[PDB]
Design a protein around this ligand. Structure first.
Ligand SMILES: [Mg+2]
Ligand SMILES: [Zn+2]
Ligand SMILES: [Zn+2]
Lengths: 49, 49, 75, 248, 149, 1327, 100
RNA sequence: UGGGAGAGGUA
């Protein structure tokens, strides 16, 4: 219901398809936050496992 | 405002916590009917195209 | 359980996995099209699933053995 | 007596002076080095800084407010309003409880039951009905001078510090035959506090019984039977009333 | 016209609500009697006598109105403007007492205690206690559900 | 997109070049004639991607068929324009510049690294002075700052040998040249010979910084930027306004300034510029980069056009309006709307009235889905026109969709969790939501313009979560206490009170009725009244031992109304709950009784029927408010005139001058207080029994039927003080500073105040009215701090299996019990079995949840105290177990696992912030010669035991007091049997003999003078300040001796009883008199929400009660100092441990006593740091819990104590190492207590030494900032400092908590996400 | 007062100075309803007579060399209507008094 | 489109 773009498009077409189920992902404000802490010269990254 | 015939009594929970029950004659006689004038504008601008 | 779900909580034991198993049964009725074991009474699939849980026809291990026997009869 | 009133004419005079020195510097610089025979005053006086400063003030100062125009009481209470904030005044976030209280010198100059009920509560006030200003800007309120017990019809506007010396009678004290008080132990207020006094000691009397309250707080009937927390909200909520189809 | 809640009064202590209700009941009673005389088309002397009696009614009030100087067309015009209720001034901290409110209620042939016996609208039965009925002055604030919704 | 950590570190220049997509080289954003970006500008399409979706810039490649294609005419690749918010650039700086965070975010991270002053570092970076880097000669040492004169003379002197530079390049050369391992070895060997504590703490700071660097792998020169990254252009957009003019982007302005000054520095460096111009340009570039990173930090803030300071990247991260606190911890939301609420009194408990237009807008994709599934709409334009035209088939589809689809209803501020509740909507015509009248107490929602927000949940998981967790028929009880929140409010209460009242001769009394249906028929036909006493045949069901209901019918003596209410009381309850005049407390106890006996669904149906019958019969009552119903007592003028005569008498006494102004003011305050309470009692009597006039035999009195009294007495609305101000007297109104005015307001609101009385009352009116605003600000801030300290606390286990716990005793402080044991223990779990001989020798086993009947078992056996487990003593690391928390108070049964008890605890504490025989213990006492028990120990208190074995009374006996009675005997109650000296404390000896004035000189040790008012020669002792030359090394000791002169002896010890007495101890007795055993010798004279905040922030008071450290003999330390010094000599150990005591601080214990660890030696409020350090965890929990519950019990607020224990457990999470074990925890550094316990667990597993720790009570803010997760710490507070320390240390958040999984966006480890998170744990562990 | 606070003004040396003579206010171009319709402020032209003299520094006291007195236009000031309000850009504002 | 200030208001 918020800043997850693929999740909200898929949620709209899943509701119209009659299948009330979401597949969520990363909110875009978190990527905004990652790019701003990176633009402060500080390497922050989602460590994969 | 207008002078309203007012009775002080609880009426079936329809004036429960600072609520007000109003007769339909106040809506028929158009006592608290207000006029709300609203201005919309349309500007014709010089687009470079 | 169109009013309250305390009877279905008394059936299972824990509201959180009650929500999860009712969600899985409601997905099997909404997506999969499997038969509601309780009569429908023109209801949404979530209330049909909660009615089935409160009646005591399905559980977590009952749903697991049901989908396992479907996987065995197909594959 | 330590807080004066800086009104619209004084504020626009100061912004005009700021624009005038901002252009006076440049015209003195031009008169220093320019030619002399053909130098008119017109091409060296520039109307840009003065008009820019006074238009900036009148359009977007913190005290140039879009007027409330719900009913006539809204506009008249806006036009008789007193703001502690703005350029040179306080700030809303860092004001304590001491500036947001009813000082005893507000009797007749500032209303104690008309103010907003949010984070703006003691910082926005309302002028009382009979309140004036001095030539210096201090608030003053009228009193009837009593002489030898005879309460006359002579009216003196006493400022905030002058009334702190005398004993001033209450407006709810009884008079007869255009004479004197009907009792001996008469209530009064002096030097902040308010205690009982004799009927000959008194120096002044309030000019009316509605001298304390503002304009909007003096439209409430039976205000004296109201709690002040609800009278405040009634005086506030009268200014939000829409005008209806037929007046009544 | 409006049914308010009585449980909002004794916690917030705004008794000017109740006193304005009683004085409005008295004022509307005077307006009802003037409207009855005007609808029956009685006389100019009856109207002058009754309006004068309603005017010089208070205890030791400062207003002295006298319809002897009022010509008959002005008394008919005044009764026409008063036929919807006589307006009543009441200065702040210089009000009307409950004795003067009850005196105006006794002039208007209304109950002195301020309360009449109301009947139920739907069942037709009667409320078991007398209910305070009068004429408050209501305003319509600018927080409308057309703008909030 | 799977990940299990978030890792932060410093950024290499090659790392920034690896994120980069091309160098920004020119400061232009866009062309302004044609809105196209410039080549290599700040908005360039060749670097940052194309502008249109799937186009190039020149428009040659327009279609998606060239999906990724680098064009030839422009060079911008055609792709999505989604890449303009992912592709960063870089700027190659022409000279190195320092990062502002690692220079100014204190501690400075470079002055902590090189051990240099920040003034010297800034003087180097500001091009004001040189600094040498390497000295080939011995004359110059490293990190020595030279002025320019010294630099020139050393440059002509040594020629070429040394090399000193200036600016950020010098500091980068220093950080490149330093050697971290050799510096760490040098500082570690320096820490051995370090005896100075300030050098030790500074050295541990520097050593931990060096060790963090060498364990993270960051090079230390990366704190000096050489490449500068550039934010992507869709994260700093150009927003055109309406008038063809773009709006000011502050990040674009700061980036443009950096590019301009960098290009000018490149041109100056190429042009072989003079050194003054080059140094000025480098200084301007350094300050421009520092402004871009954090504008208002180093110098003045660089302003924009409107004289505001520009926003920078640190401003975009930090603050309440920052990215974290405004877009990650809470955000705007689709499928949501708002409107004004009204009453729906026709609804059930699970229904809300939702408008048609609102639900039609919120539910539009569901309507499209059902339009496709029913076939009425084939094209999307047809479905759009069908929903837009609002056809009747569309309304039928909407009624089908709304059906069994809960919506969430929320009202700001959400102070606790019952401000979001799920309802099933009813579609009503209108524009206002219709809230049910019983949930308005939970929402705090009256109907004077409150608005509420609807939130539609979409998935089946969300719908079932709303149905099974957040439905309004699941939230019957509070989580804070156990009390129900679905309580009738004022109109239900007035109706049920008026239904169950009684009269004496009403109508048809004394009839005998067949039952409730006949009573209803009688009242509805009108043959009887609602209050007439009748004889009703009543059948009631009671539960057996098994869960069945048997009936027993009788004839009761009721009214008609109680019979009518029995028709809605369900089967199972007795009749005694309906047989009285029901007020608010009786109605809520009826609902609670029905709940505990029957369950959830009968309580829901009973609350709805209660609401309908109360509303209908209050409508039938007609209870109005009139001006005659506020009856003034006739005796008011008499009491007022009598108090006027009394104040005239006291004023006449002041005219006579025998009384002063202070005693006159106090006496007139007592006079008007007595007059006010007398007129209030007279008013209340004449109001509450005004219906004496009755009939059928006589005039028989009864409870009144006055309207104002019925509203006050039913608990509906009003209280004694408000009815007092309505009818009796207004009272004593206070000045704005808090002083009381000597004349009160003597008129009520019926008569009406005058001008002066209204102006007096406006002071207190505006005081309360401003107090509400400032208190809701402070309450919101405190609730935020509490939630952020206790967010991650989840029940993760089932039983830790420990034997610690807290001994819950009934609070008996004062002369009364405050909370009994049943309320203090109902719902806990016993840490041990009950073991008393007692009355019956009860044994309840360990680990049992104390139910209601178990609490009645404790009542009937009169048990005194019981040790139960708490969350502060749970042995589960990373959470608590279910058995150390006990009962889930919102549900009643034991708590499940996966519950956010910390969020529940913090909301429960921060929600009412807007409402803000004889027995002796510690017996060290002797008897005098008069047979009375004098007391010589300060920490003694008396406990009146009772016959049942409890302590129903306790008092603290003062020091210097004397006890009349003894111990163990039956004490005649009703009087404090001991007597004390309340003003001056005497210096009582316990040994007899004749006094000789030895170890003193009358004239030198004391000031030899008679006392000035009595004439008799006294011994006034002058203090140590004004002593003689021989007074600075000795003190006067009143050595009580025998009749001839030998010193008497302490019995049991060898100490010859000479008593050193301090100054201001006026000895009236002379020599030669006999001193007894138990007599004296001299005399020595003597907001609530901020209190809750100060107790939770662990703030030390300014004058702490100084506490004795150990057990031993207290003496005095080094004398002749301004601060008097104290040392305690132990009987076994060594303690020269001194303490500075200020000038105006007294002493409670003298220099010749035996004190123990934790003994108070100065009066004052205690400090919880000291309480923890000297008395332990259970002591500091009991202190904080009782000190917070004091305020909450004062303002009538009932909160359980496990919530405060949860917060204290979250405060106590830190342990400092004092003796190192075998792990790498050195000394005196704060480590996490759970990790220390895990390390000691594995050390006793593998058989090693183990570590010795000490708990550290931190405040809420310090604990929530020192948590081991930089995302939670940064999203709470001090984002600059938290991200700086975390980036230097190279941490990683493991996303273990609720805030981290909310920010990143996964399921929280609580509730229905606990299963998925432990699934992920077993996957990434067993993998 | 604002004109006398800054006038007169000498040079960097003293060879010329600017004297203020008198000010006046012209008639407004539009009435209040016209400004509220057109969306322009309700103002007035400020016309002030100035005097420019030149000190002959080649002379010991060269008082009179060149006397200019023309009408100067120093911006605009928005007038207050007959109710106490100002019309600024067509909208109606109120300058609230301050208590400092 | 959609950003930032300032002012006032509602609970
Ligand atoms: Mg409200
Ligand atoms: Zn191209
Ligand atoms: Zn354990």
């Amino acid at each position: 219901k918020s800043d997850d773009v693929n999740g909200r498009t898929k949620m709209y077409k899943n509701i119209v398809d009659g299948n009330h189920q979401m597949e969520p992902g990363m909110p875009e404000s978190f990527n905004v936050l990652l790019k701003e802490i990176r633009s402060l010269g500080i390497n922050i990254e989602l460590e994969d496992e | 405002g207008q002078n309203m015939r007012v009775a002080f009594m609880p009426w079936n929970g329809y004036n429960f916590e600072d609520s007000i029950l109003v007769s339909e004659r106040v809506v028929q006689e158009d006592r608290f009917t207000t006029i709300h004038i609203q201005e919309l504008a349309c500007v014709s601008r010089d687009t470079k195209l | 359980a169109r009013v309250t779900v305390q009877d279905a909580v008394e059936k299972i034991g824990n509201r959180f996995d009650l929500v999860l198993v009712a969600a899985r049964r409601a997905r099997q009725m909404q997506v999969g099209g499997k038969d509601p074991l309780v009569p429908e009474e023109n209801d949404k699939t979530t209330v049909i699933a909660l009615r089935e849980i409160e009646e005591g026809l399905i559980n977590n291990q009952i749903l697991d053995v049901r989908e396992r026997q479907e996987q065995q009869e197909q594959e | 007596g330590n807080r004066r009133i800086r009104s619209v004419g004084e504020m626009a005079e100061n912004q005009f002076r700021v624009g005038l020195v901002r252009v006076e510097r440049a015209v003195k610089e031009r008169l220093s080095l320019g030619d002399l025979d053909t130098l008119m005053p017109q091409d060296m006086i520039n109307a840009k800084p003065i008009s820019a400063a006074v238009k900036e003030f009148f359009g977007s100062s913190q005290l140039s407010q879009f007027m409330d125009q719900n009913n006539p009481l809204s506009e008249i209470t806006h036009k008789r309003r007193i703001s502690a904030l703005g350029p040179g005044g306080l700030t809303r976030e860092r004001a304590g409880f001491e500036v947001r209280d009813v000082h005893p010198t507000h009797y007749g100059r500032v209303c104690p039951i008309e103010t907003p009920e949010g984070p703006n509560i003691g910082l926005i006030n309302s002028l009382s009905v009979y309140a004036q200003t001095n030539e210096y800007g201090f608030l003053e309120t009228p009193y009837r001078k009593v002489t030898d017990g005879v309460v006359t019809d002579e009216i003196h506007y006493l400022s905030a510090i002058e009334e702190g010396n005398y004993v001033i009678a209450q407006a709810n004290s009884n008079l007869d035959e255009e004479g004197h008080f009907v009792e001996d132990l008469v209530t009064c207020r002096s030097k902040g506090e308010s205690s009982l006094f004799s009927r000959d000691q008194v120096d002044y009397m309030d000019v009316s019984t509605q001298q304390v309250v503002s304009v909007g707080a003096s439209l409430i009937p039976f205000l004296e039977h109201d709690d002040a927390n609800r009278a405040l909200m009634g005086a506030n909520m009268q200014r939000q009333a829409v005008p209806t189809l037929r007046a009544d | 016209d409006i049914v308010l809640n009585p449980l909002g009064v004794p916690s917030r202590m705004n008794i000017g609500q109740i006193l304005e209700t009683h004085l409005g009941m008295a004022a509307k009673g005077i307006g009802d009697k003037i409207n009855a005389m005007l609808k029956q088309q009685q006389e100019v002397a009856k109207l002058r006598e009754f309006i004068q009696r309603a005017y010089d009614l208070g205890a030791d009030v400062r207003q002295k109105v006298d319809l002897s100087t009022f010509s008959d067309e002005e008394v008919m015009r005044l009764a026409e403007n008063l036929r919807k209720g006589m307006p009543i001034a009441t200065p702040v901290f210089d009000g009307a007492k409950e004795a003067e409110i009850k005196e105006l209620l006794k002039l208007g042939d209304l109950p002195t205690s301020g309360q009449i016996r109301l009947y139920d609208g739907r069942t037709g039965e009667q409320f078991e206690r007398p209910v305070t009925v009068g004429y408050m002055y209501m305003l319509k604030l600018n927080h409308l559900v057309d703008d909030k919704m | 997109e799977e990940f299990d950590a978030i890792k932060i570190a410093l950024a290499s220049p090659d790392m920034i070049r690896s994120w980069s997509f091309g160098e920004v080289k020119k400061p232009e954003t866009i062309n302004y004639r044609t809105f196209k970006p410039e080549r290599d500008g700040l908005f360039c399409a060749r670097i940052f991607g194309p502008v249109k979706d799937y186009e190039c810039l020149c428009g040659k490649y327009k279609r998606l068929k060239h999906r990724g294609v680098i064009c030839e005419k422009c060079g911008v690749e055609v792709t999505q324009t989604k890449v303009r918010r992912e592709r960063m650039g870089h700027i190659e700086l022409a000279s190195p510049t320092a990062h502002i965070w690692f220079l100014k975010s204190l501690p400075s991270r470079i002055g902590l690294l090189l051990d240099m002053p920040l003034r010297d570092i800034e003087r180097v970076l500001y091009f004001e002075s040189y600094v040498v880097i390497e000295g080939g000669m011995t004359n110059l040492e490293r990190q020595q700052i030279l002025t320019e004169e010294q630099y020139l003379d050393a440059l002509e002197e040594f020629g070429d040998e040394f090399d000193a530079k200036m600016g950020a390049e010098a500091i980068q050369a220093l950080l490149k040249s330093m050697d971290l391992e050799q510096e760490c070895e040098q500082l570690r060997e320096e820490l051995n010979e370090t005896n100075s504590e300030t050098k030790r703490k500074k050295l541990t700071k520097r050593i931990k910084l060096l060790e963090a660097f060498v364990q993270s792998g960051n090079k230390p020169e990366w704190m000096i930027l050489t490449v500068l990254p550039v934010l992507p252009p869709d994260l700093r957009p150009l927003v055109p306004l309406d008038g063809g003019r773009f709006a000011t982007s502050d990040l674009n302005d700061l980036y443009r300034r950096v590019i301009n000054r960098n290009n000018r520095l490149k041109r100056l460096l190429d042009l072989a510029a003079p050194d003054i111009i080059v140094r000025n340009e480098k200084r301007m570039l350094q300050e421009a980069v520092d402004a871009l990173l954090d504008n208002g930090r180093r110098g003045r803030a660089i302003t924009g056009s409107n004289k505001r300071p520009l926003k920078s990247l640190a401003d975009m991260i930090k603050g309440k309006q920052g990215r974290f606190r405004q877009n990650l911890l809470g955000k705007r939301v689709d499928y949501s709307g708002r409107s004004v609420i009204t009453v729906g009194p026709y609804l059930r408990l699970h229904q809300c009235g939702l408008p048609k237009k609102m639900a039609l807008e919120l539910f539009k994709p569901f309507i499209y889905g059902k339009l496709e599934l029913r076939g009425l709409a084939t094209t999307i334009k047809a479905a759009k026109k069908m929903v837009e035209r609002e056809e009747a088939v569309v309304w039928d589809i909407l009624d089908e969709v709304i059906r069994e689809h809960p919506v969430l209803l929320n009202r700001a501020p959400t102070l606790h969790r019952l401000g979001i509740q799920a309802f099933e909507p009813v579609l009503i015509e209108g524009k206002a939501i219709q809230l049910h009248p019983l949930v308005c107490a939970a929402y705090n929602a009256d109907f004077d313009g409150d608005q509420m927000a609807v939130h539609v949940p979409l998935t089946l998981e969300a719908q079932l979560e709303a149905r099974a967790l957040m439905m309004s028929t699941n939230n019957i009880l509070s989580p804070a206490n156990g009390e129900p929140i679905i309580v009738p409010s004022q109109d239900v209460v007035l109706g049920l009170y008026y239904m169950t009242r009684d009269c004496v001769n009403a109508k048809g009394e004394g009839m005998v009725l067949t039952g409730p249906k006949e009573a209803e028929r009688l009242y509805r036909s009108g043959l009887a009244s609602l209050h007439a006493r009748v004889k009703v045949r009543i059948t009631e069901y009671e539960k057996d031992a098994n869960g069945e209901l048997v009936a027993k019918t009788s004839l009761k003596d009721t009214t008609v109304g109680r019979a009518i209410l029995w028709m809605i009381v369900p089967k199972g309850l007795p009749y005694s709950i309906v047989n009285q005049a029901l007020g608010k407390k009786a109605i809520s106890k009826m609902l609670n009784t029905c709940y505990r006996i029957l369950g959830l669904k009968p309580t829901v149906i009973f609350a709805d029927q209660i609401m309908y019958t109360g509303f209908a019969y209050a409508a039938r009552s007609g209870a109005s408010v009139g001006i005659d119903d506020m009856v003034i007592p006739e005796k008011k003028h008499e009491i007022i005139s009598e108090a006027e005569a009394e104040v005239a008498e006291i004023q006449e006494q002041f005219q006579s001058g025998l009384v002063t102004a202070g005693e006159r003011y106090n006496k007139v305050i007592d006079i008007w207080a007595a007059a006010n309470d007398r007129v209030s009692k007279a008013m209340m009597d004449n109001l509450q029994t005004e219906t004496v006039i009755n009939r059928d035999g006589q005039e028989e009195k009864q409870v009144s039927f006055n309207s104002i009294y019925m509203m006050a007495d039913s608990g509906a609305r009003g209280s004694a003080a408000q009815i007092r101000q309505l009818a009796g007297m207004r009272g004593l109104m206070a000045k704005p500073d808090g002083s009381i005015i000597e004349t009160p307001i003597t008129a009520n609101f019926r008569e009406g105040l005058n001008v002066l009385q209204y102006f007096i009352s406006t002071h207190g009116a505006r005081k309360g009215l401003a107090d509400t605003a400032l208190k809701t600000a402070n309450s919101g801030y405190l609730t935020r701090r509490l939630v952020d300290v206790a967010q991650d606390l989840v029940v993760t286990e089932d039983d830790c299996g420990t034997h610690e716990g807290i001994m819950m005793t009934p609070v008996i402080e004062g002369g009364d019990v405050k909370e009994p044991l049943r309320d203090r223990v109902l719902g806990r779990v016993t840490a041990e079995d009950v073991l008393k001989p007692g009355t019956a020798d009860i044994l309840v086993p360990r680990n049992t949840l104390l139910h209601e009947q178990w609490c009645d078992l404790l009542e009937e056996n009169s048990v005194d105290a019981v040790k139960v487990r708490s969350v502060v003593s749970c042995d589960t690391d990373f959470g608590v177990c279910a058995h150390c928390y006990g009962r889930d108070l919102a549900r009643g049964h034991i708590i499940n696992k996966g519950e956010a008890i910390g969020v529940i605890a913090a909301q429960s504490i921060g929600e009412p912030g807007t409402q803000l025989s004889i027995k002796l213990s510690n017996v060290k006492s002797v008897v005098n010669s008069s047979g009375k028990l004098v007391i010589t120990s300060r920490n003694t208190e008396l406990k009146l035991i009772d016959e049942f074995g409890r302590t129903k009374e306790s008092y603290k006996v003062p020091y210097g007091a004397v006890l009349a009675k003894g111990d163990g005997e039956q004490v005649a109650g009703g009087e404090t049997v001991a007597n004390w000296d309340p003003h001056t404390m005497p210096v009582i000896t316990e040994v007899s003999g004749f006094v000789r004035f030895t170890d003193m000189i009358d004239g030198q040790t004391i000031t030899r003078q008679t006392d000035e008012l009595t004439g008799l020669s006294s011994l006034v002792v002058l203090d140590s300040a004004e002593r003689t030359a021989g007074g600075k090394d000795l003190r006067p000791a009143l050595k009580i001796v025998d009749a001839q002169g030998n010193d008497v002896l302490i019995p049991g010890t060898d100490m010859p009883a000479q008593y050193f007495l301090p100054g201001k101890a006026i000895v009236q007795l002379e020599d030669g008199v006999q001193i007894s055993s138990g007599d004296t010798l001299a005399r020595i004279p003597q907001g609530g929400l901020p209190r809750v905040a100060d107790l939770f922030e662990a703030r030390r008071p300014k004058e702490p009660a100084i506490l004795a450290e150990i057990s031993g003999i207290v003496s005095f330390g080094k004398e002749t100092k301004g601060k008097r010094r104290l040392v305690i000599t132990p009987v076994d150990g060594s303690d020269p441990y001194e303490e500075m005591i200020p000038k105006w601080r007294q002493l409670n214990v003298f220099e010749g006593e035996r004190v123990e660890r934790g003994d108070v030696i100065s009066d004052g409020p205690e400090a919880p740091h000291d309480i923890l350090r000297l008395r332990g965890v259970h002591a500091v929990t009991r202190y904080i819990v009782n000190e917070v519950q004091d305020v909450y019990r004062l303002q009538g607020v009932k909160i359980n104590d496990k919530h405060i224990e949860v917060i204290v457990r979250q405060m106590l999470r830190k342990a400092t190492i004092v003796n190192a074990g075998s792990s790498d925890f050195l000394e005196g550094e704060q480590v996490e207590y759970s990790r220390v316990k895990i390390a000691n667990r594995e050390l006793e597993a593998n058989g090693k030494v183990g570590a010795t720790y000490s708990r550290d009570l931190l405040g809420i803010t310090k604990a929530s900032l020192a948590t081991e997760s930089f995302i939670s710490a940064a999203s709470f507070q001090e984002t600059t400092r938290v991200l700086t320390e975390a980036a230097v240390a190279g941490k990683r958040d493991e996303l273990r908590g609720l805030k981290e999984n909310v920010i990143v966006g996964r399921l929280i480890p609580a509730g229905t996400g606990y299963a998925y998170h432990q699934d992920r744990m077993r996957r990434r562990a067993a993998g | 007062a604002a004109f006398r606070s800054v006038f007169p003004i000498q040079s960097y040396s003293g060879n010329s100075e600017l004297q203020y003579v008198s000010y006046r206010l012209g008639e407004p171009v539009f009435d209040v309803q016209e400004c509220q319709i057109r969306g322009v402020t309700y103002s007035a032209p400020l016309r002030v007579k100035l005097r420019l003299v030149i000190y002959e520094r080649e002379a010991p006291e060269g008082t009179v060399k060149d006397i200019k007195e023309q009408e100067v236009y120093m911006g605009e000031i928005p007038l207050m209507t007959d109710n106490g309000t100002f019309v600024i850009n067509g909208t109606e504002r109120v300058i609230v008094s301050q208590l400092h």
